[PDB]
Write a protein that binds this ligand. Structure first.
Ligand SMILES: CC(C)[C@H](C(=O)O)[C@@H](O)C(=O)O
Ligand SMILES: CC(C)[C@H](C(=O)O)[C@@H](O)C(=O)O
Ligand SMILES: [Mg+2]
Ligand SMILES: [Mg+2]
Lengths: 364, 364
């Protein structure tokens, strides 16, 4: 039967990189005999312009009818004057995560062979490589906890946010981390602030409870402040990093920047039934939008993660991943991945998409 | 009149680096005619061993009678089996900050001339230098907010922590940041998560209120996740970074590690009357304790900050800072500051203290 994908390209470079993801997907559909239908919906900035809000009713209903959401990027200068609490990025993402109970965020990041020099780390550290999967709990903690608000006036006006976690919420994300570790390098590093936070005392406790089901996986705990430091000295010693909502927000961006290659990084946000939202790690880069410069790899790898986790099409997901590897080691690189004495070897967004789609079609 | 200093050397390397701070201070007392008396008290690990708790009554009362606290480092392997919530570091520091209302934490970090190569940043980034002062609010936010605890049992057992800030608490730390910026490079960067947290919406609002008193200082706002990334790409563009409690905990460690030289970094925690606690940024390094290897610079610069901020002895504080600079550019370096082909040029803890004290005495 026909899978149904909701396509939410958003703002900035979203539509131009989404076009290349669709191109690649068409090559995969033909090679593997998949029947996939796509419907496009406004989200973010474009939705505010066209409908008055960043997540229109029609869009939300469209996602409810889909097997997965293939998401681009949202936001730009034009809407920053809106209060930070009505801007498009938060306005679209928090309710989507909340509505669909997308509790599990996966953010894989690795240094690719040959591109170590783009990392902002010292060259002897980046030479060692790294490959870290950040597992972030997405629907609990301080993002959605109540009470939240403010009271009082004048000097004594106060605001409050509540961080809350239940054993059940911790155990379900921890299990995901352990199962992932089992397929990787069998180490989970859980990140908390258990010397200060009641939530973190419970976090650490529950993670140790879950660990009894995985005697083959090594478990260590690290404080969030220390983790930001250790990622700079020994990123090669981490495998799976397991984080609460806010800690994962922070650490995943640190790790992404350590690659030096955010155009290569994708993200999956999923619920327990396998429905998810799949997006590039980076932003909407409105200043390069419309010029065919943007790197479509992150959006293409988003589609690969969607095939794998939501559609259960492992062979098709793998084929995309290998087509990307082929591009990277055949010199098909975009401008931001070249030292700028090389900048004239740069491929455009379309050339990248064509190459990758052709590779899939050729049986890579 | 006689100043009174409470000396809390703590664990690990604390006592051996504290001895060098006292040595330097004796040279300063003679050169500037200061009358300072010191009383030593147990804190941390040693206090648990000798008194059953990390912050004995006698120690707390001793700090109440002092003009300032000169603090070493607390913690070590021996006490980690204690729950993270009874260990010495949290057990000593949170109640001290709480009791004395030490709302303002200053954590200056800079790359020193000639030591850029110790930074874990790529050499073209570290070559540009940086000098960032982290101002962290220390007594509010999620560290001390109520309610805090847990309820329920089994799968539905839940924990909670509450982040709370008042206009008054935000305005007082913001003013400190702006006044510091005014003496530095006239830029404050305020760090928040205003797209998610009610506290951060209020934070950003109050900081903009305070800014009207400082039309000469540039103000920008950045999200905490983005800040962790931008520190890796352009640390030279930041001057004063203004942070809430938890965000400052995280960012200040990231910045410290970017120096590559944590043995050079000191911290001040102060209340509005000028009483403070002054400590090295790093930990107690129990594995090198007792060998005369530890770098005493951080502890010596702690004493300089104490002279400046608590005792109002600017000339004496400055003299120490220049004696440290003299050591660094006369090849007086400890082992961790040398590439290990150079490791035999290393000076010991005592040699460093002697050199620095002699320099102060010679009128540096
Ligand atoms: C836009 C914002 C609400 C979001 C988050 O904080 O989760 C973003 O920073 C992220 O990492 O996806
Ligand atoms: C020991 C711990 C409570 C403390 C904090 O979180 O403030 C420490 O990490 C720090 O940075 O001083
Ligand atoms: Mg983020
Ligand atoms: Mg800390």
């Amino acid at each position: 039967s026909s899978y149904q994908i909701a396509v939410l390209a958003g703002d900035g470079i979203g539509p131009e990189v989404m076009a290349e993801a669709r191109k690649v997907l068409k090559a995969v559909e033909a090679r593997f005999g998949l029947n996939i239908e796509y419907t496009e919906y406004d989200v973010g900035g474009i939705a505010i312009d066209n409908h008055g809000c960043p997540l229109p009713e029609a869009t939300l209903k469209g996602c409810e009818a889909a097997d997965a959401i293939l998401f681009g990027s949202v936001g730009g200068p034009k809407w920053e004057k809106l209060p930070p609490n009505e801007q498009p990025e938060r306005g679209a993402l928090l309710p989507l995560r909340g509505h669909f109970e997308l509790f599990c965020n996966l953010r894989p990041a690795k240094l690719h062979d040959g591109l170590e020099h783009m990392s902002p780390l010292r060259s002897d550290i980046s030479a060692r490589g790294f490959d870290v999967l950040c597992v972030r709990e997405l629907t609990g903690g301080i993002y959605f906890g109540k009470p939240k608000g403010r009271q009082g006036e004048g000097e004594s006006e106060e605001a409050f946010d509540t961080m809350r976690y239940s054993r059940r919420e911790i155990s379900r994300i921890a299990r995901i981390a352990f199962e992932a570790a089992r397929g990787r390098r069998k180490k989970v590093t859980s990140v908390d602030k258990a010397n200060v936070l009641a939530c973190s005392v419970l976090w650490r406790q529950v993670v140790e409870e879950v660990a009894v089901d995985f005697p083959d996986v090594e478990l260590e705990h690290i404080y969030i402040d220390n983790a930001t430091m250790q990622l700079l000295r020994r990123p090669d010693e981490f495998d799976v990093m397991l984080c609460s909502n806010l800690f994962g927000d922070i650490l995943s961006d640190e790790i992404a920047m350590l690659t030096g290659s955010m155009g290569l990084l994708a993200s999956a946000s999923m619920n327990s039934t396998g429905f998810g939202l799949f997006e590039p790690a980076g932003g909407s880069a409105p200043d390069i939008a419309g010029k065919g410069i943007a790197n479509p790899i992150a959006q293409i790898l988003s589609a690969a993660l969607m095939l794998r986790h939501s559609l259960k099409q492992e062979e098709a997901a793998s084929a995309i991943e290998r087509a990307v590897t082929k591009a990277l080691n055949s010199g098909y690189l975009t401008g931001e991945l070249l030292s700028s004495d090389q900048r004239h070897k740069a491929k455009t967004t379309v050339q990248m998409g064509d190459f990758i789609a052709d590779a899939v079609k050729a049986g890579v």
